[model samples]
Target: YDIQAWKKQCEELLNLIFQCEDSEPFRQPVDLLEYPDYRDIIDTPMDFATVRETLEAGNYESPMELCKDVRLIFSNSKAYTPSKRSRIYSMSLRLSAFFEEHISSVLSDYKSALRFHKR
Candidate 1:
């Protein structure tokens, strides 16, 4: 198994932790029922532009792309649509903070998960 590939997968998954509904874009979708799970994986292939955005915004703590994504999710999911809206929102906030706080944690988590295996 490729360790680097696994690491990359986890990093991608971490990025998926973002929910568009959490920001201003929440107004895009009036119906609010079209938002997918915030924890869902982003299957679309990533590019350097995205990497650049993440790196450049790391210092600011809130990149437009990322913030916009949060809004998108909120617009679809809506503030009241989620069954466990309050709890999920709480978790999402913590998760977002944690992700921004420890960029290396993604690699750490991937390595930890693979520790029991031969690697």
Candidate 2:
């Protein structure tokens, strides 16, 4: 299945996300004391650091699983931030768009490889 290749692609995506300008807020775990309700509000909190940890640990079952956590970072931001005009909210939107655009190409490449194997 060329799992190594898939893993490499995932790592590349993570690096791209980390290099984004507005990715600061999402780089680490949120301060639970500051946002006491963060855990309650966010069922599964996600961040770039955690995603890298998971990737390095080889914990993800599939690329889709990795994608799920990445998407959650933005969804949680949108849910908690509420105001679309807010800086963090806007950053989430921008980062989400960027990730989706890049990830689409990765996913398409994976699909093509799968089709080749099936042939």
List candidate 1 segments past 4 Å from native.
1-85, 104-119
| Model 1 lDDT on a 0 to 1 scale | 0.42
lDDT at 21, model 1: 37
The local distance difference test score of model 2 is: 0.85
Taken over the whole model, the C-alpha lDDT of each candidate is 0.42, 0.85
Clashes in predicted model 1: 11
Best by lDDT: 2
lDDT of 2 by residue, 62-109 (tens): 677888999999999988995889999999899988898888866777
Worst 10 residues of 2 by lDDT: 1-10
Assess the local accuracy of residue 52 in candidate 2 as a C-alpha lDDT between 0 and 100. 92
